[PDB]
């Protein structure tokens, strides 16, 4: 799955 | 585990200090995969790797796609309430 830093 | 309500405080110059993975298009919740040290989520004390983010500020995230969640989460400012659960 994709991962985003927020 | 139990559903928890968690408060996070951040200033406008910083992000949440979280990496998230998952999303409805993958058939899994929005999951916290990293807590970045020293940033707001770490400092708040009640958010952990493995937590599913069920809602933020009353906005349901249980059926949200990954990028939908990014937009919703990054829009929140100041005093931010999370509903989370660790499974």
Residue numbers in the entry:
A (entry chain C): 5 to 10
B (entry chain A): 284 to 370
Paper text:
In previous work, we have investigated the binding preferences of a PDZ domain that is known to interact with the C-terminus of the cystic fibrosis transmembrane conductance regulator (CFTR).
For proof-of-principle studies, we chose to further diversify the position with the highest baseline affinity, i.e., P−1 in , by introducing three halogenated substituents. Thus, our initial set of ligands enables us to test the feasibility of affinity modification by preparing and screening a larger library of chemically-modified peptides. At the P−1 position, we coupled trifluoroacetic acid, 4-fluorobenzoic acid, or 4-bromobenzoic acid to the side-chain terminal amino group, as illustrated in Figure 5A. All three peptides reveal modestly enhanced binding affinity. To explore the stereochemistry of these interactions, we also solved the complex structures of CALP bound to each of these three peptides. The modified lysine and the terminal moieties are oriented similarly in the complexes with and with the additional P−1 substituted peptides. Thus, S−1 and S−3 can intersect and could potentially be bridged using a cyclic peptide, a strategy previously employed in targeting PSD-95. In addition, the substituents increase the contact surface area of the modified P−1 lysine residue by 69, 32, and 40 Å2, respectively.
